[PDB]
Amino acid sequence: IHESSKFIDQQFLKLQEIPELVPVGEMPRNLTMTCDRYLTNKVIPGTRVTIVGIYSIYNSKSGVAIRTPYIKILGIQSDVETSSIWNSVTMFTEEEEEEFLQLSRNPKLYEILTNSIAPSIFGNEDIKKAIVCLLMGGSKKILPDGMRLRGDINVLLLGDPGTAKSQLLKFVEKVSPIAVYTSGKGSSAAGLTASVQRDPMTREFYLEGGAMVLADGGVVCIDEFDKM
Amino acid sequence: PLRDLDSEHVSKIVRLSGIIISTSVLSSRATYLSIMCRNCRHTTSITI
Amino acid sequence: LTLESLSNVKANSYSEWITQPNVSRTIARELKSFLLEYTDETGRSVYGARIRTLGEMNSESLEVNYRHLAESKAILALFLAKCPEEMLKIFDLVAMEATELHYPDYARIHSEIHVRISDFPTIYSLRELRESNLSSLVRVTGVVTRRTGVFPQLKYVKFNCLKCGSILGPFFQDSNEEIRISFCTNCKSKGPFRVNGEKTVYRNYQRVTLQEAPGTVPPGRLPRHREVILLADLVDVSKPGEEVEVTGIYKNNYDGNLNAKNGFPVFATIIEANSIKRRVFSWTEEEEREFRKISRDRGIIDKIISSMAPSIYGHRDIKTAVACSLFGGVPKNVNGKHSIRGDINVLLLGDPGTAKSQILKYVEKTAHRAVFATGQGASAVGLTASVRKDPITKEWTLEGGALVLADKGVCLIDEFDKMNDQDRTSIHEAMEQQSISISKAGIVTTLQARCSIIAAANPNGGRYNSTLPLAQNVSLTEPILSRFDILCVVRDLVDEEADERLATFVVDSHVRSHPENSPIPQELLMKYIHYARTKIYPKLHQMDMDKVSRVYADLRRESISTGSFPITVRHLESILRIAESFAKMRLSEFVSSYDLDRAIKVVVDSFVDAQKVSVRRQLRRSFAIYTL
Amino acid sequence: ERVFQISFFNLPTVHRIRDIRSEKIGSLLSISGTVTRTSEVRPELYKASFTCDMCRAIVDNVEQSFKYTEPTFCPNPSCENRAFWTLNVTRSRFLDWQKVRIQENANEIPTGSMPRTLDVILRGDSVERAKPGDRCKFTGVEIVVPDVTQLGLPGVKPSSTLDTRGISKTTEGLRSLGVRDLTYKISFLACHVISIGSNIGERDQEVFLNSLSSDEINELKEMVKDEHIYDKLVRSIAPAVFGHEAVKKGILLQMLGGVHKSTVEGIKLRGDINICVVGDPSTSKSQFLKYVVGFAPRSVYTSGKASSAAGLTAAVVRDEEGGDYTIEAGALMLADNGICCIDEFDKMDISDQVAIHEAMEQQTISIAKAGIHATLNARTSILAAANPVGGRYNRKLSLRGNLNMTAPIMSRFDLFFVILDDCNEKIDTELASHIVDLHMKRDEAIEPPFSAEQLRRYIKYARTFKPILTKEARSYLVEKYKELRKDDAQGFSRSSYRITVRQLESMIRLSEAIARANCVDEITPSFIAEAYDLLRQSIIRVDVDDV
Numbered sequence A: 001i002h003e004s005s006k007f008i009d010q011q012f013l014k015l016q017e018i019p020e021l022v023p024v025g026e027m028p029r030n031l032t033m034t035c036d037r038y039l040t041n042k043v044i045p046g047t048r049v050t051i052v053g054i055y056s057i058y059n060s061k062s063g064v065a066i067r068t069p070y071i072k073i074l075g076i077q078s079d080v081e082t083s084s085i086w087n088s089v090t091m092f093t094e095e096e097e098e099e100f101l102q103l104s105r106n107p108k109l110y111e112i113l114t115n116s117i118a119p120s121i122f123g124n125e126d127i128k129k130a131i132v133c134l135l136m137g138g139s140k141k142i143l144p145d146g147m148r149l150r151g152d153i154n155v156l157l158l159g160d161p162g163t164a165k166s167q168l169l170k171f172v173e174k175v176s177p178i179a180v181y182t183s184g185k186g187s188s189a190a191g192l193t194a195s196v197q198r199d200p201m202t203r204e205f206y207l208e209g210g211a212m213v214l215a216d217g218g219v220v221c222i223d224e225f226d227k228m
Numbered sequence B: 001p002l003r004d005l006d007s008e009h010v011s012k013i014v015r016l017s018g019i020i021i022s023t024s025v026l027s028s029r030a031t032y033l034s035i036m037c038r039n040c041r042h043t044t045s046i047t048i
Numbered sequence C: 001l002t003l004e005s006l007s008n009v010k011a012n013s014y015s016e017w018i019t020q021p022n023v024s025r026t027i028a029r030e031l032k033s034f035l036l037e038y039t040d041e042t043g044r045s046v047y048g049a050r051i052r053t054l055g056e057m058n059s060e061s062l063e064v065n066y067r068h069l070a071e072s073k074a075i076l077a078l079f080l081a082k083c084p085e086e087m088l089k090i091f092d093l094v095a096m097e098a099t100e101l102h103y104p105d106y107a108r109i110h111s112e113i114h115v116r117i118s119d120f121p122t123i124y125s126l127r128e129l130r131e132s133n134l135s136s137l138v139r140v141t142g143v144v145t146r147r148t149g150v151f152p153q154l155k156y157v158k159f160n161c162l163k164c165g166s167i168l169g170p171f172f173q174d175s176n177e178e179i180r181i182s183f184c185t186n187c188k189s190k191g192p193f194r195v196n197g198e199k200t201v202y203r204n205y206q207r208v209t210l211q212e213a214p215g216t217v218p219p220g221r222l223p224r225h226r227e228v229i230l231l232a233d234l235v236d237v238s239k240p241g242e243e244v245e246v247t248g249i250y251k252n253n254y255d256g257n258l259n260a261k262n263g264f265p266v267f268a269t270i271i272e273a274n275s276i277k278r279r280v281f282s283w284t285e286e287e288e289r290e291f292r293k294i295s296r297d298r299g300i301i302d303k304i305i306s307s308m309a310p311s312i313y314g315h316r317d318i319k320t321a322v323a324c325s326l327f328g329g330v331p332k333n334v335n336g337k338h339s340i341r342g343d344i345n346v347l348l349l350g351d352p353g354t355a356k357s358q359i360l361k362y363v364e365k366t367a368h369r370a371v372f373a374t375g376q377g378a379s380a381v382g383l384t385a386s387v388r389k390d391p392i393t394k395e396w397t398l399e400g401g402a403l404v405l406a407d408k409g410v411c412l413i414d415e416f417d418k419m420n421d422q423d424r425t426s427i428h429e430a431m432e433q434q435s436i437s438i439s440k441a442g443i444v445t446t447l448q449a450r451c452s453i454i455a456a457a458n459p460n461g462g463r464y465n466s467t468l469p470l471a472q473n474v475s476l477t478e479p480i481l482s483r484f485d486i487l488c489v490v491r492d493l494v495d496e497e498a499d500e501r502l503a504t505f506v507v508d509s510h511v512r513s514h515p516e517n518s519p520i521p522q523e524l525l526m527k528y529i530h531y532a533r534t535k536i537y538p539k540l541h542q543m544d545m546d547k548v549s550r551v552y553a554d555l556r557r558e559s560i561s562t563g564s565f566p567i568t569v570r571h572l573e574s575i576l577r578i579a580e581s582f583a584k585m586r587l588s589e590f591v592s593s594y595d596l597d598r599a600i601k602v603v604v605d606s607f608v609d610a611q612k613v614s615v616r617r618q619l620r621r622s623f624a625i626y627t628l
Numbered sequence D: 001e002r003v004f005q006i007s008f009f010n011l012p013t014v015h016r017i018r019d020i021r022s023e024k025i026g027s028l029l030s031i032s033g034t035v036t037r038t039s040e041v042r043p044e045l046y047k048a049s050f051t052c053d054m055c056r057a058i059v060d061n062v063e064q065s066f067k068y069t070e071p072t073f074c075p076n077p078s079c080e081n082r083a084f085w086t087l088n089v090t091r092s093r094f095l096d097w098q099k100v101r102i103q104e105n106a107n108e109i110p111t112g113s114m115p116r117t118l119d120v121i122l123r124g125d126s127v128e129r130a131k132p133g134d135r136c137k138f139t140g141v142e143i144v145v146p147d148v149t150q151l152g153l154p155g156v157k158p159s160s161t162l163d164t165r166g167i168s169k170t171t172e173g174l175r176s177l178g179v180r181d182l183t184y185k186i187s188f189l190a191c192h193v194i195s196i197g198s199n200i201g202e203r204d205q206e207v208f209l210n211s212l213s214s215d216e217i218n219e220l221k222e223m224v225k226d227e228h229i230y231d232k233l234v235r236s237i238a239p240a241v242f243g244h245e246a247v248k249k250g251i252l253l254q255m256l257g258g259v260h261k262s263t264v265e266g267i268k269l270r271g272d273i274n275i276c277v278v279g280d281p282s283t284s285k286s287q288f289l290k291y292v293v294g295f296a297p298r299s300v301y302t303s304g305k306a307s308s309a310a311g312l313t314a315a316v317v318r319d320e321e322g323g324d325y326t327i328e329a330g331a332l333m334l335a336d337n338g339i340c341c342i343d344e345f346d347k348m349d350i351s352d353q354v355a356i357h358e359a360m361e362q363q364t365i366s367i368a369k370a371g372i373h374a375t376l377n378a379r380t381s382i383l384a385a386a387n388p389v390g391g392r393y394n395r396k397l398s399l400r401g402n403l404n405m406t407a408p409i410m411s412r413f414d415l416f417f418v419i420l421d422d423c424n425e426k427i428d429t430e431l432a433s434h435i436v437d438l439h440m441k442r443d444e445a446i447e448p449p450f451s452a453e454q455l456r457r458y459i460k461y462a463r464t465f466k467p468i469l470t471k472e473a474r475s476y477l478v479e480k481y482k483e484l485r486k487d488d489a490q491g492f493s494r495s496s497y498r499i500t501v502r503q504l505e506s507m508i509r510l511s512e513a514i515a516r517a518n519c520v521d522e523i524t525p526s527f528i529a530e531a532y533d534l535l536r537q538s539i540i541r542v543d544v545d546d547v
């Protein structure tokens, strides 16, 4: 009787060893894991996790008595947390609020935020001021006619090689809450802008990826912007 | 490491690291299910 | 019974003879006497020492030599050769009792001792296994092609009964066939019993495909392959791609309804491995003292330069670049905000016949984590990260590519010029961010690619033209050319004496290699490079800043005056990184002045020789003080 | 008890693969064919030993005929049922078994039809007597094997149902019968395998001279003793071709080859000579390839556009849409320790050129397709024929500009024979006379110094030698390398392709081949001079426009 029965969620995860430490000519080995209740939907594919769990057995119907191992997850720890819109947190504690309010009344606030932008880079003070302004951005407006005015600022740095523009891009990628650093032709296997590809096991259209979309609400640092 | 998992770790708690390929869709498992006999109409509950 | 009574056989077959309890107990007693009393007439018991060593090392493997048993009891050696399975079970029990004679608490730790027979005399190739070798011990050589993962196979099988819930006793699982129980002995029922994995004990299992080594195959014949099953202790021993020699029992794999395609009652064959023998960057306490002894020599660095690629002659600056790339600098991250790369990228641009590929092969042999890749070739690891689904396994796997796979190591890219676009983008990201970002198949992540790159390229048109500068001789663009620290342009100009010595070297190499006919040793050198990479971490101090800043302006103003492509800050960083790499070969914790001068020499020579000849003539005379 | 096998041979007639008819099933026969696939040796259940399930006594020596059979006698009187048994694979007896696939010979295929294959099975001592790519004459029995794929075929497929006439039945109640299809394909079971030569007409020398009788070993000694033997060897190669003595010398040296050497580090030094023939249209460049395929053992012929990556190296193939994947030996392994003759190397696409220079680099073939990972032996000399870009050969352009073949392809060819057409009356008249004499006289117009069979015996004798460079040969070789590179330096861009070290290994290889041609154990400096002269004549000077 289904309208008087109670159910929980269960999820299959697939875990590989990290591709940095794999034998050169060998396939990276993987295990299936099962999680339930509040352990489901806690990690996205691609994240690096250490997981505590029971190493257990199932029989799948290659050897007279051969069993497939799996992991029953008891806990998941995320080593690094990816930056995205859904993963962004808007909650603040009162101590951080007080610290930011106390910071905002400093009369040399502009000077210290410009000095904090890439302290290892000699010169380019105007560029660092520009980078601070880019990090803040302007006010976005939505008007009664429906058309919107953007607040984001797009800055181009073009010049001779060896003038630390790539390091400025890297530091902006590090300091931004949401950021991606890509080339003009994209990444090694991550596209630029937006890619719509068919789903693997159900053959349905979905947004494959792309620098301009994963970095929504953030900064895309496009190195070698002329080749595109 | 993932390659040092042997048969001595079977049905034991192991801590192990890696990267995630895929997260499957959420399947619905049953915790409490009420059952009723087809013709006998005996009502029973199984808790899991 | 006696040995001479064991020589005579009464049963129909050998296996039925050994199956008898009296023959089994006689063989057990004789194996006990052999294990406890064998000496090599030198006053030492090698097997007692082996038992003590395996007990103190907490290992379940006992190596028993076949020639020792043959000299001691020849009939038991013949019995082992003919019927290895049950006699190995007997000698398992005998070796377990011999271990319990010394260590009485070893049974609770392991309860299983595997006997590994070594130096079996008969040698078989995989192409000559026949009908006579079934259920017999065979010693076969070959190359491992690929191996499966380690799976848990049931060893002590425990059941539970669905009628009463009682948990039954443990039963040994024979490796030949599945075991089943039909009685409960508590509720006296033949009901459905289920195996519970929490109280069942398992052994490790691996499946390894072995082919005949391609050197030994007859001409028109394909290399035969067999399949080898590795048990609990032998798992993950032999990596694929290496020549290994396996001793084991040759037997038939049983399958349901045989093969319908053949129409004949044909079985497949397996080898259950009894022993694995391989036909390491570990330094001992003496090895580090030897490293310190060889480092205190004044001319140590040059010896390392002379140790790079002995089969390659005359390319001293290329070998210096190889030594710098192999040792490498130190990466650093000041305050977490600003990162400076710490490994030397070397580009070998050369005409055909300058032996760049042999240098790449030498580095692949020498280095710790060396990954070989190429642009034009197909059967090699790719340079691009990917998410690939196996067509048969239907399993999605994340391949980091050769750049991620060479992390904390070296990636060697042969034929750097005719690369395609995706591989160029992968190299560009791997040298800029030292990482590779993937957004494929629902996987959005970044993989660390902190890898040094030693690339080889051919100039445009097949020759280097010294009249044109470097960028016009190579299809590589300016940003990818600027990322290399050492830029070795090698050209085969015609010099009579050089041609004579090179031809002499090559012809001598041929005449040494005929079948009818001060450098550091390679084994010491490889561990030396690993040690210096893993424990030194050199550092440069504050009072040398007045000379590098001086020579930086000295090259910059001359580059402005001459009008070549400019010297940037990255040449200074390349100087400071090559200095830290040269200081590692001395096992030195600090950077010296001669170290900096040698690094400045390397960088100046690498910058000058990539120029137009008009630029070369002025730059050689202006920078004569630093070239020395 | 030892199993015995009777092998019949010298049958009066040899049948084609397409002449196999159903009237000869269960009859002694002799067929011929070219072996394509060889399986590995597998055990076949000959004398099965069973144990009954409920009486549990062992019985042995059960006849096994093709399909798997279980005895129904059960001679112990303890139990009363017959069908249930269990096989004991340890106690039972097995024989060797191989399924080798053979294909119709190229001269036997009809006018428009494709070749059709046949699976012949070898048992016992006949196993592994056939190699991938050779012509074998199989004597055996035409047998018949169940085939399931004939279900969708048109026509009435025979079937078997159980006859129920003498069986008493009652309609008590509480009608099923066993019907099974009779669909089959013709197979062969051979007791004798002999390998006739793949030609139209063992490394140690002692086993070779033991094989020859007194008369032909005397003839071989007479050939060895002759002082003008090298000129006769050159003149005996490709008699239908007029002129082009340098190409004939190269072909002879390729058929001889150099020694294979392995250094202490582990790298391998190639003894195989790879030759590319480039030139103007209608210069008999394909006649050389025809002669090498029709003459040299272990030789295969391939066209450039009709090529493929899998067909030249190795193929991973699927049979009957099953889970099993097998390996087809490619053209490079069908010519292993022989010559792969590839006409129109220019028309070959880039992927196949990549897949073949990989097997020129490592002299091996790598397979990673599907679940099969394999390393394969393809040490093979390559005789390539290429046409220049634009059709005609431009004298003003270098060899690299005339050819679209890539630099890794070009770097491993020792000899580049550019054969050209020049219009003068004398040699055109003599060539025309030669061609019309060929058309008039067939074999009467061909008068070589040696016939094909004695040429092949001399080549196979000479390949046993392993020539060794002497003390003076070393210095004379390095002097020739010095003067050759000095000629490059003086010529500048006038040379077609510059001499590097690779030409020095090719010079050593050609010197070893010449020393083999004269049947000597040590390389004389005259052989060095001949190899250097041939290599110098390989490079032609680039014509330069006047300024």
Ligand SMILES: Nc1ncnc2c1ncn2[C@@H]1O[C@H](COP(=O)(O)OP(=O)(O)OP(O)(O)=S)[C@@H](O)[C@H]1O
Pocket (backbone or CB within 6 Å): A120, A121, A122, A123, A160, A161, A162, A163, A164, A165, A166, A167, A168, A224, C340, C479, C482, C569, C570, C573
């Ligand atoms: N003014 C500067 N102050 C501090 N460090 C600098 C300065 N200019 C260059 N560098 C350093 O020198 C290197 C220069 O690399 P980048 O200039 O960032 O490369 P880029 O030339 O800007 O980008 P390209 O044009 O694609 S090569 C980095 O390691 C910087 O840290």
Ligand SMILES: Nc1ncnc2c1ncn2[C@@H]1O[C@H](COP(=O)(O)OP(=O)(O)OP(O)(O)=S)[C@@H](O)[C@H]1O
Pocket (backbone or CB within 6 Å): C311, C312, C313, C314, C315, C350, C351, C352, C353, C354, C355, C356, C357, C358, C359, C458, C502, C506, D411, D501, D502
């Ligand atoms: N300086 C040298 N010392 C020793 N052997 C050499 C030298 N130069 C060339 N060789 C030999 O010449 C051959 C050249 O082989 P490769 O290493 O493939 O040449 P390469 O420099 O890679 O040029 P490619 O193949 O056109 S990219 C090998 O047999 C080398 O051993």
Ligand SMILES: Nc1ncnc2c1ncn2[C@@H]1O[C@H](COP(=O)(O)OP(=O)(O)OP(O)(O)=S)[C@@H](O)[C@H]1O
Pocket (backbone or CB within 6 Å): D240, D241, D242, D243, D280, D281, D282, D283, D284, D285, D286, D287, D387, D431
């Ligand atoms: N120099 C020659 N000596 C003998 N026969 C020749 C010569 N040149 C041409 N022929 C004959 O003329 C015909 C030329 O055919 P092919 O050998 O196929 O031409 P080819 O040299 O291969 O040029 P392509 O590249 O195929 S257009 C054949 O019948 C040859 O026997």
Ligand SMILES: [Mg+2]
Pocket (backbone or CB within 6 Å): A165, A166, A223, A224, C479
């Ligand atoms: Mg940049």
Ligand SMILES: [Mg+2]
Pocket (backbone or CB within 6 Å): C356, C357
């Ligand atoms: Mg090369």
Ligand SMILES: [Mg+2]
Pocket (backbone or CB within 6 Å): D285, D286, D287, D343, D385
């Ligand atoms: Mg032709």
Ligand SMILES: [Zn+2]
Pocket (backbone or CB within 6 Å): B037, B038, B039, B040, B041, B042
């Ligand atoms: Zn009921």
Ligand SMILES: [Zn+2]
Pocket (backbone or CB within 6 Å): C161, C162, C163, C164, C165, C166, C184, C186, C187, C188, C189
């Ligand atoms: Zn029970």
Ligand SMILES: [Zn+2]
Pocket (backbone or CB within 6 Å): D052, D053, D054, D055, D056, D074, D076, D079, D080, D081
């Ligand atoms: Zn019975």
